[PDB]
């Protein structure tokens, strides 16, 4: 076994034990430890755990401020070498090169392992989590001079190669093999976007370019907008713009729905208008695109839509199958949205809420320290959890969609805005009285509405079409 | 076989609010929770002798979905109307979660509570007498609740059902 | 869903870390940045069952040879990398190979050859040369670009159905 240099002089050299670190009950899992025992297991020297890195840098803010996890791993990268043992002492005194073994062993074993490993903790930590420096450019400087500084030439290939990378992101592309399938086009033609409406789009492509949408935006979505909960206190459109726009986007095309559904006041172009929305809801479905089922299904489930019986009584019993099945993913804390989730084959867009109710749970019902012999160890289970939700969220940012923008449909969906100049509440209260309206509670009987649709209202159909 | 309750918590985001189902649900003896496994939300226990069992929908973290509030909502029979006593803002939002739920639910009588929830030792601002008279004005009950020391969390779910059991 | 532990090994330079972000975001990395140990994965459907894919992407310097028994205790599969521009890069495969024996004590391991950057015309490690050594090893072996993706999802599921007969 390898002796260790002197605790007195290099701290990561502590034994483990029970008031430093703990174990969960082929690597170990820890529970908890100080910050000191936390790093060491970060850049240990007898195993491999990039997850470990990454769960690490993810979270450690919580418990470790960024300047101070830099001197930490710096501290650990600076290890005292052993000096030469009796038999090195008694080749030396005799004019002869000592064997050096264990201080050869020492370096291949220990040094080499432990100074990879900071430099990966330093290239991960610039590669994924560089907000850090952006938002303190003291840290960078520091950064940059200590991997500038290092010598060696065993470690002379990854410094070059973090100084370089450093560099990129400072002034900070799909290949696929088969093609994406043809733009469908209905009623409003390429270009026409002043005509551009529901029913008037192809429900294929609206479908598609939601998703493609949907997609952009949440891949853009970082772990640094999630962890410490940052997206419900006072400043998350500074900590959480990107999930928030997600988040807004699939409010703004519930909204419309409903609005689209209640302004037909006229029975029959209503029943088509909700047979359309189900349409593109299949088409969702298809496209794993749960984010926008659940918008379907919200704007079906709202108060002013889910009273509308004259309207759903006429929609094809095939199409309540649809809308019913995709009701279910919600049902019993959404049981079969997860299970559904975890057998397809990806792209898809998740439901993003989901996330963030296991994360903010999390991180409020567990403590930040666990107190064992009156020291304070640093609960890294509750850390290792909330990694393990952003890094299922990350998995799923990976895989990018097979399909053609269409920059003018997109366009009009990006500058969605059904609620206009109204508040919220003005709004909501308008889409229920027109329910309201074109429905009256019982027993007052049913009204009749003028038509309002100039072009046909058969739909097209959600199968695709594929000329030559 | 037991009757099974389902109740929704709703309000404001960001003041503490999931405090509340996490201390009812948890061991109440070691903070430890998981929200990731099935079990984490249902919970059995005995309510003036009768044995049921709650199932908890708290969808805290997701306010900003706001046009999901009408489907969450519908899924419940009773309500918990939380509002943070050392925020006043979230206390103003509880009129509009009450008509927002007796519009989903169609009725101008629903089985709700309303709960004020003290989740830091920041100054209180929602002095209880207010709370006292709106909750009155509405006709249901008011408790207060500890997000840290578990005070008053039994309370809050158990006289939730006892208004639904007396509907 | 049943989860795979893959390992990615071979020289410095071959495109262990092209082929494996190829696999995962559909992109081509252009830069040679060495690495030290990264991880990646993968939730996909392969003959119809669903899988979680870990890959473990190693270092191919030699700087880093001492670290190479570490990740190789993990792994259940190893996709063993050359490049056919690069005729040293294909005999250090047999180096890989053994020490992968050693540290698992078994001869039955889960392997695939991989000869990577097939996009380029300079060959000069030839299709029999690597096939043959395939044959001696049990395994299969193909041929990839990370810059096309030709082969890349064929060398990684065929590793995956491997590691499921195993
Ligand atoms: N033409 C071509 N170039 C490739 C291919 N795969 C990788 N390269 C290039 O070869 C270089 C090395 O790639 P890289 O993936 O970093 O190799 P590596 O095996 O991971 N190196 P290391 O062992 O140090 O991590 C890069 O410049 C990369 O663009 C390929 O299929 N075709
Ligand atoms: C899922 C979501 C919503 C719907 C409704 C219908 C709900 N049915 C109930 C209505 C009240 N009475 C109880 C039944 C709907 C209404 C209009 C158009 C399409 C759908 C059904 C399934
Ligand atoms: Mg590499």
Known sequence: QMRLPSADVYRFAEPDSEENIIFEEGIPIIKAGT?????????????????FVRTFLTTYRS???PQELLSLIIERFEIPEPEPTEADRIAIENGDQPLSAELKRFRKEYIQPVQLRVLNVCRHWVEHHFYDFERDAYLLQR???????????????????ITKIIQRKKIANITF??????????????????????????????????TLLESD????????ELVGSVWTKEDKEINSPNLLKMIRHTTNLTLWFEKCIVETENLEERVAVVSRIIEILQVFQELNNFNGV?????????????????????????????????????????????????????PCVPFFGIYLTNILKTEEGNPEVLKRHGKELINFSKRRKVAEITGEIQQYQ????????????????????????????????????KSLEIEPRNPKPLPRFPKKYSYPLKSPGVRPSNPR | ???????????????????????????????????????????????????????????????????????????????????????????????????????????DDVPMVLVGNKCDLAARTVESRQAQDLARSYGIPYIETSAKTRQGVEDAFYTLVREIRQH
């Open chain 2, 1 to 107: 076989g037991m009757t099974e309750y389902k109740l929704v918590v709703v309000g404001a985001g960001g003041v503490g609010k999931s405090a509340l189902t996490i201390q009812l649900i948890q061991n109440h003896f070691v903070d430890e929770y998981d929200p990731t496994i099935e079990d984490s939300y249902r919970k059995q226990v005995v309510i003036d002798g009768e044995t049921c069992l709650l199932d908890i929908l708290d969808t805290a973290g997701q306010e900003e979905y706001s046009a999901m509030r009408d489907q969450y909502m519908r899924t419940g029979e009773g309500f918990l109307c939380v509002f943070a006593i050392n925020n006043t803002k979230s206390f103003e939002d509880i009129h509009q979660y009450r008509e927002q739920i007796k519009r989903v639910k169609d009725s």
């Open chain 1, 35 to 51: 910050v000191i025992k936390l790093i060491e297991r970060l850049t240990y020297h007898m195993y491999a755990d990039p997850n």
């Open chain 1, 143 to 161: 950064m940059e001079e200590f991997i500038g500084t290092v010598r060696g030439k065993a470690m002379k290939k990854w410094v070059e190669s």
């Open chain 1, 398 to 433: 990976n895989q990018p969609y097979c399909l053609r923008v269409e920059s003018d449909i997109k366009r009009f969906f990006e500058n969605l805005n059904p609620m206009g100049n109204s508040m919220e509440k003005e709004f909501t209260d308008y889409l229920f009285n």
């Open chain 1, 217 to 224: 935006l949440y891949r853009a979505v970082q772990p640094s």
């Open chain 1, 63 to 65: 418990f470790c401020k």
């Open chain 1, 294 to 346: 659940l918008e379907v299904v919200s704007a079906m489930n709202s108060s002013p839509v889910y009273r509308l019986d004259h309207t759903f009584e006429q929609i094809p019993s095939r199409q309540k199958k649809i809308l019913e099945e995709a009701h279910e993913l919600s049902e019993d804390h959404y049981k079969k949205y997860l299970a559904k989730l975890r057998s397809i084959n990806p």
């Open chain 1, 177 to 210: 093999q088969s093609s994406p399938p043809t733009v469908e086009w209905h009623i409003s033609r390429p270009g026409h976007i002043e005509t551009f409406d529901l029913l008037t789009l192809h429900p294929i492509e609206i479908a598609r370019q939601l």
